Design a protein around this ligand. Structure first.
Ligand SMILES: Cn1c(=O)ccc2cc(N)ccc21
Length: 123
């Protein structure tokens, strides 16, 4: 149907915008601490602590499969990256502090992304 196609076009547009947001957010992690999943080989107890791991590579895979239907779903995964890290690692670690900086700097990007999704009407 034409309606289905139109819906798919909107999703494709959302995916394009979220790809830009994702690139901007990942730029705020220059250490690449959050680039890849935490290695379960190197951190064998990780899943005892963290029930829903997340990282930028995993987000990018979902994004390219057009698996984010709206911005909230994308934000939920970004928040997992930060929140998981701030629980597993103590305040006096480079990991926790990287997450705080990513949260603080990412908030600016997400603030405007929300306005853009709303104004263009991508959800
Ligand atoms: C425990 N942990 C995190 O929580 C986040 C990122 C990270 C990166 C490496 N390379 C090792 C451990 C890590």
């Amino acid at each position: 149907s034409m309606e289905q196609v139109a819906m798919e076009l909107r999703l494709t547009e959302l995916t394009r915008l979220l790809r830009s947001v994702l690139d901007q957010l990942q730029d705020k992690d220059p250490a690449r601490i959050f680039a890849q999943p935490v290695s379960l080989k190197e951190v064998p107890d990780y899943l005892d602590h963290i029930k829903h791991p997340m990282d930028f590579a995993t987000m990018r895979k979902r994004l390219e499969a057009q698996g984010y239907k709206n911005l909230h779903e994308f934000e939920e995964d970004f928040d997992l990256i930060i929140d998981n890290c701030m629980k597993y690692n103590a305040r006096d670690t480079v990991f926790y502090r990287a997450a705080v900086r990513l949260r603080d700097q990412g908030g600016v990007v997400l603030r405007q992304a929300r306005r853009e999704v709303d104004s263009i009407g991508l959800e």
